Amino acid sequence: MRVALLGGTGNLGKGLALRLATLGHEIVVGSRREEKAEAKAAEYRRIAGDASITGMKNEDAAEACDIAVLTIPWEHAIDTARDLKNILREKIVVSPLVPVSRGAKGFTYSSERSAAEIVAEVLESEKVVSALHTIPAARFANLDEKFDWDVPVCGDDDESKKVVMSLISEIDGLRPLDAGPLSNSRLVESLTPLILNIMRFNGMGELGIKFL
Amino acid sequence: MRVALLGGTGNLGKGLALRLATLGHEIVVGSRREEKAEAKAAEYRRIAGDASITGMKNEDAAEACDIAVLTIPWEHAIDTARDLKNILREKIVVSPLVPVSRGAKGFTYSSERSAAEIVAEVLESEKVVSALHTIPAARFANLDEKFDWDVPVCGDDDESKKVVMSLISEIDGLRPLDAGPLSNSRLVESLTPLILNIMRFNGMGELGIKFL
Ligand SMILES: C[C@H](OP(=O)(O)OC[C@@H](O)[C@@H](O)[C@@H](O)Cn1c2nc(=O)[nH]c(=O)c-2cc2ccc(O)cc21)C(=O)N[C@@H](CCC(=O)N[C@@H](CCC(=O)O)C(=O)O)C(=O)O
Ligand SMILES: C[C@H](OP(=O)(O)OC[C@@H](O)[C@@H](O)[C@@H](O)Cn1c2nc(=O)[nH]c(=O)c-2cc2ccc(O)cc21)C(=O)N[C@@H](CCC(=O)N[C@@H](CCC(=O)O)C(=O)O)C(=O)O
Ligand SMILES: NC(=O)c1ccc[n+]([C@@H]2O[C@H](COP(=O)([O-])OP(=O)(O)OC[C@H]3O[C@@H](n4cnc5c(N)ncnc54)[C@H](OP(=O)(O)O)[C@@H]3O)[C@@H](O)[C@H]2O)c1
Ligand SMILES: NC(=O)c1ccc[n+]([C@@H]2O[C@H](COP(=O)([O-])OP(=O)(O)OC[C@H]3O[C@@H](n4cnc5c(N)ncnc54)[C@H](OP(=O)(O)O)[C@@H]3O)[C@@H](O)[C@H]2O)c1
Ligand code: NA
Numbered sequence: 137m138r139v140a141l142l143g144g145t146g147n148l149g150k151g152l153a154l155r156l157a158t159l160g161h162e163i164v165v166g167s168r169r170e171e172k173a174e175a176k177a178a179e180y181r182r183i184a185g186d187a188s189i190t191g192m193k194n195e196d197a198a199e200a201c202d203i204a205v206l207t208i209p210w211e212h213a214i215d216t217a218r219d220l221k222n223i224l225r226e227k228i229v230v231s232p233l234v235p236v237s238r239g240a241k242g243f244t245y246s247s248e249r250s251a252a253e254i255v256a257e258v259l260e261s262e263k264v265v266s267a268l269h270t271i272p273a274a275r276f277a278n279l280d281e282k283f284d285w286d287v288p289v290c291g292d293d294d295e296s297k298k299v300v301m302s303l304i305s306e307i308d309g310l311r312p313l314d315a316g317p318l319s320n321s322r323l324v325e326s327l328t329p330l331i332l333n334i335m336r337f338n339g340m341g342e343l344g345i346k347f348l
Numbered sequence: 349m350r351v352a353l354l355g356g357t358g359n360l361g362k363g364l365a366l367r368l369a370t371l372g373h374e375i376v377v378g379s380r381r382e383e384k385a386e387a388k389a390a391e392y393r394r395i396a397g398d399a400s401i402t403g404m405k406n407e408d409a410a411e412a413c414d415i416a417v418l419t420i421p422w423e424h425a426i427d428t429a430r431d432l433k434n435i436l437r438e439k440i441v442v443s444p445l446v447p448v449s450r451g452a453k454g455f456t457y458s459s460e461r462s463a464a465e466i467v468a469e470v471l472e473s474e475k476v477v478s479a480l481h482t483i484p485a486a487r488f489a490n491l492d493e494k495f496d497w498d499v500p501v502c503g504d505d506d507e508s509k510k511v512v513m514s515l516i517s518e519i520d521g522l523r524p525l526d527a528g529p530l531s532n533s534r535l536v537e538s539l540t541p542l543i544l545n546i547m548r549f550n551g552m553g554e555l556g557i558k559f560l
C-alpha cells in the first residue's frame with residue numbers, strides 16, 4: 137500500500153520507512169519542507185537498497201497515501217492533524233503519539249485523555265488506529281538489530297484496525313495484538329512512560345515489550 | 349523469612365504460597381475465617397510437599413510475619429489494611445493490588461490514585477512495595493508451568509524494596525525490575541487492565557510481560 141509518514145524525517149519515521157520499504161510498500165516521507173523530505177527519502181533509499189521512497193511536503197504526502205502515520209511529537213501532531221483534517225478524515229491514520237513528561241521521580245503520562253482519542257476528535261474520524269508506542273526508534277532503525285516485540289493496537293473501526301495490524305505483522309520481529317477500542321489507547325500509550333522508567337531505574341538501554 | 353499472605357486462600361495467594369514455601373520461607377495463609385485459612389494451608393502443604401505453611405485469621409497472620417502480601421481484591425484490601433494498620437505499619441507490605449473493572453467495552457483502570465499509594469496512606473508507612481500485578485494466578489500456581497516474566501517493583505523505601513526484589517528474584521522464571529518510587533505504581537498497575545484487554549480481544553490465555 138501507499139504509506140505516508142508525516143514528519144517521517146525524524147527518529148521513528150526512519151525506522152518505519154526502512155522496514156516497510158524493503159517489504160515493497162510505497163513510502164512517502166512527509167515534511168514541513170519539501171527539500172528536507174526529499175533529502176531524507178534519498179538517505180533512506182540508499183540505506184534500504186531496493187525501495188520506493190519519495191519525499192514531499194506533509195500536505196501532498198497526506199493526499200497521496202492510503203494510510204498516514206503521525207510520526208510527530210504529540211503536541212505538534214495535533215496541530216498538523218487539524219491542518220490536514222479534510223484530507224486525513226477519509227484515510228486510515230495511525231497514531232504512535234505518547235504524552236510523556238519527565239520529572240524528578242521518573243516519567244509520567246502527561247494527558248487526561250489519550251493522544252489517539254484527541255486526534256480522532258480533531259479529525260472527526262472513526263478511522264484512527266493507535267499503535268507503535270513501544271517500538272524504540274534507534275534500535276528499530278538499525279537494520280542489523282534483532283528484536284522480538286509485541287505491538288498493542290487499538291481502534292474503533294474493524295477494517296482500519298485489520299489493515300494496520302496486517303501491515304505491522306509483515307515486519308519481521310513485530311507481532312500486533314488487538315487491545316480493543318480506541319478508549320483503551322490510554323492503557324497502551326501508558327506503556328511508554330513505564331518502559332522509560334524501567335530503563336531509568338535499572339540502567340538499561342532501549343526496550344520493547346512482549347506478552348508471554 | 350516469614351511471609352503472611354492476607355486473603356491467601358485465593359487465586360494469587362495459592363501460587364505465592366507454593367513457590368515461596370518450596371524455597372524455604374515460612375508462610376502464613378490468612379483468611380477472614382480461621383478454618384478456611386487452616387483448610388487452604390493443608391491443601392497447600394499437600395501440594396508443595398516439605399514446607400512450612402500454616403493458616404490463621406488475617407489479624408493473627410499479620411502479627412506473625414515480617415512481610416505481609418495483600419492478596420485481596422483492591423477495595424477490600426484497602427479496608428483490610430486500614431483495620432490492621434497498627435500491625436501492618438511496622439511490616440514490609442507488598443501490594444499486588446490492581447484497580448481494574450471488567451466493563452462491557454473492555455477492562456479499565458478504576459482509580460485516580462494508585463492502589464499502592466492509597467494503602468501506603470492508610471498505613472502511614474513508607475514500607476509499602478508495589479509488585480506482582482502482572483503474574484497470572486493459574487499459570488503461576490501450576491508447579492509444572494514454564495514461564496519467563498518480568499515483575500516491575502515500586503516503592504519509596506530502598507531497604508524494603510531491596511528485600512522484596514530479592515525475594516521475587518529467588519523464584520525461577522521471575523525477574524524483578526525497579527520501576528522507581530511508589531508514585532509510579534499507577535503505570536505498573538495499569539499493565540493489568542491492558543493485559544486483560546489483549547487476552548479478550550485476541551482470544552489469548554493468561555499472559556505475563558517481558559521487557560526486551
Ligand atoms: C539521538 C539518539 O537518541 P537520543 O537523543 O539518545 O534519544 C533519547 C530518547 O528519545 C530515546 O531513548 C527514545 O527511543 C525513548 N522513547 C521515546 N521517547 C520519547 O520522547 N517519546 C516516545 O514516544 C518514545 C517511545 C519509546 C518506546 C520504547 C523505548 O524503549 C523508548 C522510547 C541517540 O542518542 N542515538 C544513539 C545511537 C542509536 C543507534 O541506533 N545508532 C546506530 C549507529 C549509528 C552510527 O553508526 O553512528 C546503531 O546503534 O546501530 C547514540 O548516539 O548513542
Ligand atoms: C471461566 C472462569 O475463569 P476465566 O474467565 O477462565 O479466568 C479469567 C481470569 O480471572 C484469570 O485469567 C486471571 O488470572 C486474570 N488476571 C487478573 N484478574 C483479576 O481479577 N485481577 C488481577 O489483578 C489480575 C491480574 C492478572 C495478571 C496477568 C494475567 O494474564 C491475568 C490476570 C473459570 O475458570 N471459572 C471456574 C469456576 C469458578 C466458580 O467459582 N465456579 C463455581 C461453580 C460454577 C458451576 O456450577 O459451573 C464454583 O466454583 O463455586 C471454571 O469454570 O473452571
Ligand atoms: N522516538 C521513539 O523512540 C518513539 C517510539 C515510539 C513512539 N514515538 C512517537 O512517535 C512520534 C515521533 O517521535 P520521533 O521521536 O520520531 O520525533 P522527532 O524525531 O523528534 O520529530 C519527528 C518530526 O516531527 C517534525 N516536527 C517537529 N516539530 C514540528 C511541528 N511544529 N510541526 C510539524 N512537524 C514537526 C519534524 O519533521 P520536519 O522537520 O521534516 O517537518 C521531525 O523530524 C512522537 O509522538 C512519539 O511519541 C517515538
Ligand atoms: N488473579 C490474578 O491473576 C492476579 C494477578 C496479579 C495480581 N492480582 C491481584 O491480587 C489480589 C488478589 O487477587 P486474587 O485473584 O487472588 O483474588 P480472589 O481470589 O478473588 O480473592 C482473594 C481473597 O480475598 C478475600 N476476600 C474476598 N472478598 C473479601 C472482602 N470483602 N474482604 C476481605 N477479604 C476478602 C478471600 O479470602 P477469605 O475469604 O479467606 O478471607 C479471597 O480468597 C487483587 O488485588 C488482584 O488485583 C491478581
Ligand atoms: Na511480524
Ligand code: NA
Binds near residue numbers: 518520522523
Ligand atoms: Na528469578
